[PDB]
A paper describes a structure:
E. ramulus and R. hominis also shared similar growth profiles on LNT, which was consistent with the presence of a functional GH136. This is supported by the identical specificity and similar catalytic efficiencies of ErLnb136 and RhLnb136. Moreover, intimate interaction of the two ErLnb136 domains is consistent with the cooperative unfolding profile of the enzyme. These data justified the use ErLnb136 to study the architecture of the two subunits/domains compulsory for activity within GH136.
The C-terminal catalytic domain (ErLnb136II, from AA 242-663) assumes a β helix fold similar to the bifidobacterial homolog LnbX. Interestingly, the GlcNAc sugar ring of LNB in ErLnb136 adopts an 4E conformation (φ = 232° and ψ = 68°) with the O1-OH in a pseudo-axial position to form a direct hydrogen bond with the acid/base catalyst (D568). The N-terminal domain (ErLnb136I, from AA 7-224) consists of 8 α-helices (α1-α8) and assumes a previously unknown fold, stabilized by the central helix α1. These extensive inter-domain interactions (solvent inaccessible interface ≈1618 Å2), stabilize the protein structure with ΔG = −17 kcal mol−1. Remarkably, the α6-α7 loop of ErLnb136I forms a part of the active site with the solvent accessible sidechain of Y145 positioned near the active site (5.7 Å to the GlcNAc O1 atom of LNB). The Y145A mutant showed a 4.9-fold higher KM, suggesting that this residue contributes to substrate interactions, possibly at the +1 subsite.
Residue numbers in the entry: 7 to 179, 200 to 224, 242 to 663
The structure:
């Protein structure tokens, strides 16, 4: 709320987080950040997909072939461009609120204004450990030792002290009314600037429409059910009116454009993005048609999805707000078989390769999916491939030329953004992954960029079964919030109580670059980066800060040909690198800032093979 924002900037001013903690100060930092990214970031992947999506694999090869640290001096002096290249007002406000909280969590000063900063004693931190054992078990139920979580407990206690100061300032509320009044005007201006930056045409208006209308702008349709019944054709557009709220509704589409005449779903008019408020409706039946990589993963069942793109092609969906809240009768939040829920679900099944599906500038929040299930279409955005009715007739279900750009996810469970999990998973159960597997079964030209993921129950961003995916210029914070026994109460036989930030699964020669991940929430994993099972993963030019499981993992015997170079890690906790049973990892020409009592190699995930050389390791 407005009083909490006011309070946060009062604390920012006392900590010296920003020079100008007025509403205008906020506006100017927002404009400066967006201008900086526009001036300094790479240009590839900005603007219309038709100008770049066929070149993803080429630009990946060019970047993988780099022989020196691009703009090393900016990286090393703290002026490099990374994370999302455009921050919406909502992304940017949340980014700064997280910055202020983390600055409190690391402040060493005696006072914040008249607040005496508490010094957490060993007895107090041990008391918290003994009272919160459900936060400190690992994948197999074994406890982190107190010594392994001491500094994390201190961070958590300082974050709670920060949150208590905010509630104190809210309770004690003159120049607050002034600050809030000006902020409201600044916010409205920022919304106008964001909005400016944005076949048959069908118009839908929840307020003004009628489903008996022809769907022109003057006589728009009323509901998404009417859209679900349209025989959309190549070149058609469906435009949902800004200010619309589609209560309990959903968009479930099975439509194909062409390359020359794609279909477009987007917004028209003035005001807030149209809101698809699915509230647990929008039921469909998911069935992969065979067991997945582990026999315990759930692979069939009903799913609720706000947007379902079922065998769609040559379709862009843009400028929608989506939620998918549960809370139906009989349901509890951590129930073992709570329904899987998606914001946007993509499915390939009966059309072989699906081409040219693009998501853009979606705001997806409060998707309350099953806490546990990893590969149902469960989370903010989840694209999967199911066994075809008749693969010999219609071909392998898979993706080509697919992008997810400029999306803001907040409070989605389980996944944030996941693209590519396939019924063909058992074809990839070797360490080395020949290109032929991707030619037959895998995805091509997959591009995930300029997204913002925050407050995610599980993993932030994952790409699966793709050749040379490019995952870049994404910002994340505070993922893996539910990967602990307090929320992960009834896993049954599914295990899976782990998450990392932004990572590839069973990809070939993936490139993850120019990403930013902060404040991952403790679990056995909880690092920013994860060269997981797959072949050739490269991370370069990524920024990580205050992740509770450290900087980067190399996970087990099928995580092969891993390289980690030209990254910056600032005050990651637990331990910087997690080479856990991996066969190789080349970790070179990075910069790490670690506390003396945070080890370079993380405890219990230290028995893999790696070459660490030419790294700059600073003590802080
Ligand atoms: C090899 C391994 O244990 N990797 C872990 C990941 O778990 C795998 O994730 C894939 C995702 O497609 C499948 O679910 C597979 O069955 C799992 O073994 C885990 O998701 C990540 C992040 O926490 O790290 C490893 O723990």
């Amino acid at each position: 709320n407005q009083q909490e924002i006011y309070a946060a900037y009062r604390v920012a001013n006392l900590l010296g987080v920003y020079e100008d903690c007025s509403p205008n100060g906020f506006y100017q930092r927002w404009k400066q950040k967006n201008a900086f990214m526009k001036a300094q970031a790479e240009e590839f992947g900005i603007g219309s997909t038709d100008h770049f999506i066929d070149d993803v694999e080429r630009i990946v090869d060019q970047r993988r072939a780099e022989t020196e640290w691009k703009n090393a001096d900016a990286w090393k002096n703290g002026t490099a461009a990374f994370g999302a290249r455009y921050l919406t007002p909502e992304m940017y406000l949340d980014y700064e609120l997280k910055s202020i909280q983390l600055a409190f969590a690391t402040y060493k000063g005696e006072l914040v204004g008249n607040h005496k900063c508490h010094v957490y004693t060993e007895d107090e931190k041990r008391a918290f450990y003994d009272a919160n054992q459900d936060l400190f078990t690992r994948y197999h139920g074994d406890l982190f030792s107190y010594e392994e979580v001491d500094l994390i407990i201190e961070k958590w206690l300082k974050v709670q002290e920060y949150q208590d100061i905010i509630e104190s300032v809210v309770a004690n509320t003159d120049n607050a009314v002034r600050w809030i009044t000006e902020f409201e005007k600044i916010w409205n201006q920022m919304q106008e600037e964001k909005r400016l930056r944005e076949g048959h045409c069908y118009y839908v208006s929840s307020i003004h429409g009628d489903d008996a209308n022809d769907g022109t702008e003057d006589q728009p349709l009323k509901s998404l059910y009417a859209v679900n019944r349209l025989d959309l054709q190549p070149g058609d557009q469906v435009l949902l009116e800004r200010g619309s709220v589609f209560e309990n509704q959903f968009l479930h589409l099975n439509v194909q454009g062409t390359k020359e005449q794609p279909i477009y779903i987007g917004a028209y008019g003035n005001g807030a993005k149209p809101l698809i408020q699915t509230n647990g409706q929008g039921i469909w039946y998911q069935d992969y048609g065979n067991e997945l990589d582990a026999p315990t993963h759930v692979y069939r069942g009903y799913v609720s999805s706000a947007v379902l793109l079922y065998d769609c092609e040559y379709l862009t969906v843009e400028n929608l707000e989506i939620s998918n809240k549960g809370g139906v009768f009989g349901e509890t939040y951590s129930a073992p078989h709570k329904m899987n829920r998606t914001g946007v679900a993509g499915i390939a099944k009966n059309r072989g390769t699906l081409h040219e599906i693009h998501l853009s500038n979606l705001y997806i929040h409060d998707v309350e999916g099953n806490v546990y299930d990893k590969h149902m279409n469960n989370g903010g955005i989840y694209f999967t491939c199911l066994k075809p009715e008749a693969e010999e007739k219609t071909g392998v279900a898979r993706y080509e030329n697919v992008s997810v750009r400029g999306c803001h996810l907040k409070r989605t469970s389980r996944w944030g953004i996941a693209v590519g999990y396939s019924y063909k998973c058992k074809e990839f159960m070797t360490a080395e992954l020949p290109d032929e597997l991707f030619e037959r079964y895998g995805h091509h030209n997959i591009y995930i960029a300029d997204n913002y993921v925050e407050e995610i129950g599980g993993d932030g961003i994952t790409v699966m079964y793709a050749m040379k995916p490019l995952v870049e210029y994404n910002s994340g914070d505070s993922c893996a919030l539910e990967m602990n026994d307090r929320y992960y109460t009834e896993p049954e036989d599914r295990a899976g109580k782990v998450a990392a930030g932004i990572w590839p699964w069973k990809c070939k020669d993936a490139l993850l670059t120019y990403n930013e991940m902060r404040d991952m929430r403790l679990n056995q994993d909880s690092m920013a980066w994860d060269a997981d099972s797959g072949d050739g993963t490269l991370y370069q030019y990524n920024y990580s800060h205050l992740n509770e499981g450290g900087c980067v993992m190399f996970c087990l015997e099928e995580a092969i040909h891993n390289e980690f170079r030209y990254n910056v890690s600032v005050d990651d906790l637990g331990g910087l690198i997690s080479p856990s049973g991996n066969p190789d990892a080349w970790i070179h020409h990075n910069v790490f800032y670690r506390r003396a009592e945070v080890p370079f190699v993380r405890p219990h995930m230290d028995d893999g093979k790696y070459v660490a050389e030419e790294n700059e390791i600073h003590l802080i």
